[PDB]
């Protein structure tokens, strides 16, 4: 390809003209800086650094006094230094002669050096007498004269450090030898051996050789690396082909007489190992981070590579240009004869190249995605035991906490009855169920979840943030918006006084009120209050109960659920917010249940919420719960009570007592809310004085009631998600959880290439360059274990990962907290229940040939039961080859499955899975051609012992246009939108159980229940997070898995 450049110089074409050199120093008097001299200031720091042509200029002692440098910072006024820097720069005058000839350039560098010492030294005492010695017309000839007229052999100039206020001692000093011809250079460079530690580099500035001289060895490697860095860059553009301006061709320094580290450091740089990057490469500490990379590159050299790197180490005296790299000099040496180049050169051809180490000493913990089966062959490895992290670097908490919007907090889902009759035979049956249940309490396994995850410490950070953003800043909120409700509650102990509707306060003088005080309940009271006002009038906007109405809250220990609820209406006229309870303090009146006959207790809206009873026996329990409802139905107009144990007996006897009593029938509807503690199986009954006569009053099937009706008993209830700290290669049997720890950077690749047998996600981060420890975090996921322990071939991609060590696993400071329970989307949870239900059916039946999934992802593999059984996936889109080839016992026939009953592949022991149905394309719009597709789906079945599962989506109406909590799974009109996809349409339920009963034979629609919720949430340990908790039981219900298992 042979890359093009341009021999554009730099240090030469920077020196000003002689007759004009007057201006660019002193007569800078008239204007006033601002832009050139740059100055940043991190915060004890700063960096004032004037530039061009005032850089490369060294400050003369004594006159390095002056207030400028005297002002070290201590504090800086951006007005002081702009005026103050001028005061100094003004007073700098350097001896010169005004010339007439247009072909003369003033010699800055050496000339201003004389003004530094004070013209004491002869090289500066020569410029005093005849200052016209600095007017050169040709580079090199500039210096030549200041040698012949001295008899001296070499002048040496001290270089000053970059900053102006960093008044320390210089690291190195540069030296300029008198050398005209080529046969001259060879003499100085050869005599340059046997002399401490010196460096030259490739080409030269003005055509005169100049070497470097380092003070103390240690202060060599830090300069030698600062250059090797800026040269891996010049060969990035010259590798892609671009007109590069900068000149030297090869920036990499050359170590003449040198120590031993610079050897191992010279070779590693010569053969360009790095690849791209561009992540604000850390300039400080780059030295060691580069020298670490040097070692690990050697711990890989496949003989041939080793041979070379061990030679350039042992040699270290010739620059190793790479063929096309060498040509660039040859194309410019003929472009101008008489120009000096480093004589000793060696030329490459095939390097050869191998790997490239992706380094970047930036910030951030790097996340990985370990893929099963690579190139390498893994057989019988060690056990690489990690352990003991430390409380400061890794913190593990068992939560999980979630974050949403304020509008996402308040929300609920409504539910509506179905049956109009309560038969006298199933009324004594429904009784026996609730009686037989009550004795043996709900599943103890389900219990170690209700007590843990709490909305108290879940919406904790949501409100804590809005507290602080009030103590400072903030603007508008407007009376009534769910924001005015939020801040008048969650945060602040005082009152939020309003000015002109919008101003919301706005000024506290400086006394700052204390934060509020919620108590695992207040947030449930408020969330319900909003829903009461909302259920009253669907039309949005209000939350300020119309003046001179009185809401009465009932609770065991109320306040500040009423202290907050009250001062939200403080603005609007006369409102009464009264509370009753069995542990209440003023204003709330203390009173035990079932109340004295004396009390009158009158209101408009009542929210009853008591449960303080050990009670004992089912009969005493029944009488308390029922009677509290009756002493609330009369007390208010639009009141909603709270029943525990919604068992279809208890709940349906409540409707009974109320109905036959008053005006024949009451309009009832139970509801779930957000801020309930995800799964508390407690629901709220809502009663209203009807309109006419209700059609379907009672609850027939009762799915929401049923969520409670599924907790059975305790078997081996414990789970307790633990930790691990040890890896065994292709060795099954690891109880669910996660393992953190720490390993050596030299074996970090070996660790990763093993965790793939247990999971997918894994984070890693080193703390600081030197510590050489890289703590890992890995989550055990069973959705992967089924695709790993299939056969025996361990394989893996060991090669790839190893190309990260040393730096390439990220750098991170501060503390980091990883939870024990993560967080997932409500949809991702629902599928884990389709499988937890289905994994039950498959591993029980006699003989199977295979489990064949039709449509969907390569995922859904889980519940391939057993691991061994043939697993077929018929879908049009999927990645093939290696996994099917790596005999993980798979195959994917990429014909878009045609389910048109024309010709279907079947015959014996065939287990089919249909969780798709939603059209071959994302459309799913074929809703009437679906009941036709399911009609021609089951039709043509004479394949003996075959079974297949199919999924749905139904209900709609009373679960959307009444819900008013569109969190994630919301619906539009009749279309159901979930997560991604496009709106999917429902298919009339009754019609499915109307037809097919004459065509097919077996059709059992099983819904995933609470056992599936606990079990699947126990293995993956993925806690919900409100919102989806309330919306869950409704959605999960109307996706029945129809299993046609006949002959």
């Amino acid at each position: 390809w042979h890359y093009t450049s341009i021999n554009n110089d730099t240090r030469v074409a920077l020196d000003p003209k002689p007759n004009q050199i007057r201006t660019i120093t002193k007569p800078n008097t008239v204007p006033q800086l601002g832009t050139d001299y740059l100055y940043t200031f991190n915060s004890r720091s700063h960096t004032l650094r004037l530039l061009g042509p005032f850089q490369y200029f060294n400050f003369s002692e004594t006159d390095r006094g002056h207030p400028l440098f005297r002002l070290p910072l201590k504090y800086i006024p951006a007005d002081e230094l702009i005026d103050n820097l001028h005061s100094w720069m003004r007073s700098v005058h350097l001896l010169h002669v005004r010339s007439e000839d247009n072909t003369l350039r003033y010699n800055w560098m050496l000339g201003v050096y004389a003004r530094s010492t004070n013209y004491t030294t002869p090289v500066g005492q020569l410029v005093v007498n005849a200052p016209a010695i600095l007017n050169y017309s040709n580079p090199q000839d500039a210096f030549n004269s200041v040698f012949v007229a001295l008899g001296i052999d070499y002048i040496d100039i001290p270089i000053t450090n970059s900053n102006i206020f960093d008044d320390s001692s210089t690291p190195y000093n540069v030296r300029i030898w008198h050398a005209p011809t080529m046969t001259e250079v060879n003499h100085i460079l050869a005599l340059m051996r046997k002399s401490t530690l010196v460096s030259t580099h490739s080409s030269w500035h003005w055509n005169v050789l100049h070497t470097f001289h380092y003070r103390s060895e240690s202060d060599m490697i830090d300069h030698f690396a600062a250059k090797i860095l800026e040269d891996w860059r010049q060969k990035e553009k010259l590798d892609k082909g671009a007109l590069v301006e900068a000149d030297r061709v090869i920036q990499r320094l050359i170590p003449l007489s040198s120590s031993t580290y610079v050897q191992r450091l010279a070779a590693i740089g010569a053969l360009y190992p790095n690849e791209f990057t561009e992540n604000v490469l850390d300039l400080s500490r780059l030295s060691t981070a580069l020298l670490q990379l040097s070692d690990t590159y050697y711990q890989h050299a496949n003989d041939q590579l080793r041979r070379l790197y061990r030679r350039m180490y042992n040699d270290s005296r010739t620059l190793y240009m790479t063929q096309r790299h060498q040509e660039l000099l040859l194309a410019q040496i003929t472009a101008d004869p008489n120009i000096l180049l480093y004589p000793y050169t060696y030329i490459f051809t095939t390097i050869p190249t191998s790997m490239n180490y992706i380094s970047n000493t930036g910030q951030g913990r790097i996340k990985h995605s370990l893929t099963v089966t690579g190139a390498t062959e893994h057989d019988t490895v060690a056990d690489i035991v990690l352990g003991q992290t430390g409380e400061d670097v890794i913190t593990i908490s068992m939560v999980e906490p979630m974050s949403i919007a304020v509008e996402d907090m308040y929300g609920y889902v409504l539910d509506t009855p179905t049956r109009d009759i309560w038969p006298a035979d199933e009324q004594i049956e429904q009784k026996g169920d609730a009686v037989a249940l009550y004795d043996t309490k709900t599943s103890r396994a389900l219990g170690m979840f209700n007590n843990t995850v709490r909305i108290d410490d879940l919406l904790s950070p949501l409100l804590s943030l809005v507290y602080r953003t009030y103590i400072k800043g903030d603007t508008m909120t407007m009376t009534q918006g769910s924001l005015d409700h939020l801040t008048l509650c969650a945060a602040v102990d005082s009152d939020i006084t309003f000015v002109g509707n919008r101003m919301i306060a706005p000024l506290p003088e400086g006394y700052i009120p204390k934060p509020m005080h919620r108590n695992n309940s207040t947030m449930k009271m408020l969330s319900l209050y909003v829903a009461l006002k909302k259920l009253e009038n669907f039309a949005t906007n209000s939350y300020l109960m119309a003046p001179d109405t009185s809401i009465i809250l009932l609770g065991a220990e109320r306040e500040p659920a009423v202290n907050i609820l009250r001062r939200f209406n403080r603005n609007v006229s006369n409102v009464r917010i009264i509370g009753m309870g069995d542990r209440a303090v003023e204003p709330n009146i203390r009173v035990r249940v079932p109340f004295p006959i004396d009390k009158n207790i009158s209101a408009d809206f009542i929210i009853c919420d008591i449960n303080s009873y050990e009670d004992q026996s089912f009969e005493s329990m029944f009488s308390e719960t029922i009677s509290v409802v009756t002493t609330c139905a009369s007390a208010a107009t639009r009141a909603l009570v709270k029943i525990n144990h919604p068992s279809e007996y208890m709940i349906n006897s409540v409707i009974e007592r109320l109905s036959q009593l008053g005006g024949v029938f009451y309009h009832t509807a139970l509801l779930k809310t957000a801020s309930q503690n995800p799964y508390s199986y407690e629901t709220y009954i809502y009663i209203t004085p009807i309109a006419a006569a209700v059609r379907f009053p009672f609850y027939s099937n009762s799915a929401m009631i049923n969520r409670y009706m599924t907790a059975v008993a305790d078997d081996e209830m414990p789970i307790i998600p633990s930790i691990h700290t040890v890896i065994k290669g292709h060795s099954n049997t690891y109880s669910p959880g996660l393992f953190c720890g720490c390993v050596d950077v030299q074996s970090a690749p070996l660790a990763l290439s093993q965790l793939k047998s247990y999971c997918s996600e894994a984070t890693t981060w080193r703390v600081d360059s030197d510590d050489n420890l890289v703590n890992i975090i890995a989550r055990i996921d069973p959705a992967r274990i089924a695709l790993e322990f299939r056969t025996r071939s361990n394989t893996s991609a060991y090669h790839e990962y190893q190309r990260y060590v040393p730096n390439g696993l990220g750098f991170k400071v501060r503390k980091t907290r990883e939870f024990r329970y993560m967080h997932r989307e409500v949809t991702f949870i629902h599928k884990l229940m389709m499988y937890a239900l289905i994994r039950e059916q498959i591993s029980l039946t006699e003989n199977m040939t295979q489990v064949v999934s039709i449509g969907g992802r390569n995922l859904a593999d889980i519940s391939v039961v057993p691991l061994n059984m043939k697993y077929v996936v018929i879908d049009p889109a999927t990645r093939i080859e290696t996994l099917t080839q790596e005999k993980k016992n798979i195959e994917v026939q990429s014909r878009p499955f045609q389910f048109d009953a024309a010709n279907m592949d079947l015959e014996n022991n065939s287990i089919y899975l249909f969780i798709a149905v939603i059209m071959n394309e994302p459309n799913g719009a074929a809703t009437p051609a679906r009941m036709q597709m399911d009609k021609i789906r089951n039709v043509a079945t004479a394949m003996l012992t075959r079974t297949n599962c199919v999924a749905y989506i139904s209900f709609y109406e009373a679960g959307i246009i009444t819900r008013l909590d569109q969190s994630t799974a919301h619906k539009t009109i009749g279309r159901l939108k979930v997560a991604n996809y496009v709106p999917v349409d429902t298919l009339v339920e009754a019609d499915v159980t109307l037809m097919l009963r004459d065509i097919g034979i077996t059709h059992e629609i099983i819904r995933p229940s609470t056992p599936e919720l606990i079990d699947a949430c126990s293995n993956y340990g993925i806690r919900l997070g409100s919102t989806g908790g309330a919306v869950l039981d409704v959605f999960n219900h109307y996706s029945p898995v129809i299993k046609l298992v006949r002959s």
Binding site: T62, Y119, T120, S168, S216, S218, I221, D222
Partner: protein, 197 residues
């Protein structure tokens, strides 16, 4: 005392880590001569700017030497013994052959200028009558103005008798002193296969 305990807090001595900056030891040791030709430097001479006490560190950048490494040369051109890879030395003065007011002496004036300011803060705590605090601030005037007469000879005569010395025979070591922060001499032990060195 208020900020001395902030200095002697970080350490009394320090070492230099392989390729990089200094390493202060959290210990508070007293200094001894045995440490000199071995390891550790007296930390009250390092230059890393401390954010606590900027006064104890200011009176220290007031001990800086004023010289240059005049590498003999005409001693090695004559072919003499030199125990170093290359020869070197350190004369302690300059020239000021043309300077109006001698330089070397004007640097001394800055020592007195700020060292006398420190003396006042003791005559404010022990507050003695003007006459006492004056008769000391008057002594530093005489002391300093004497140095201005020595400045001439100590620059262009007692500096030629030094530049000669570094060229003599029998003198073969480098006692380089510029930059106290990082200088250690060389060990040249005569080793034997058996026995001790």
């Amino acid at each position: 005392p208020v900020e001395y305990g902030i200095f002697i807090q970080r350490g009394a001595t320090y070492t230099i880590n392989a390729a990089g900056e200094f390493e202060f030891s959290g210990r508070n040791e007293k200094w001894d001569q045995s440490l000199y030709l071995s390891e550790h430097f007296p930390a009250l001479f390092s230059d890393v700017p401390l954010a606590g006490a900027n006064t104890i560190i200011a009176i220290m950048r007031l001990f800086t030497p004023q010289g240059f490494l005049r590498t003999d040369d005409l001693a090695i051109a004559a072919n003499f013994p030199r125990a170093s890879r290359n020869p070197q030395t350190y004369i302690p003065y300059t020239n000021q052959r043309g300077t109006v007011t001698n330089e070397f002496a004007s640097r001394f004036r800055t020592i007195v200028a700020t060292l006398a300011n420190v003396v006042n803060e003791r005559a404010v705590q022990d507050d003695m009558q003007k006459a006492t605090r004056s008769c000391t601030k008057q002594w530093l005037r005489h002391l300093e103005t004497q140095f201005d007469n020595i400045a001439v000879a100590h620059t262009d005569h007692l500096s030629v008798v030094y530049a000669t010395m570094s060229n003599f025979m029998l003198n073969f070591t480098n006692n380089f002193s510029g930059n106290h922060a990082t200088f250690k001499p060389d060990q040249y032990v005569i080793t034997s296969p058996e026995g001790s060195y």
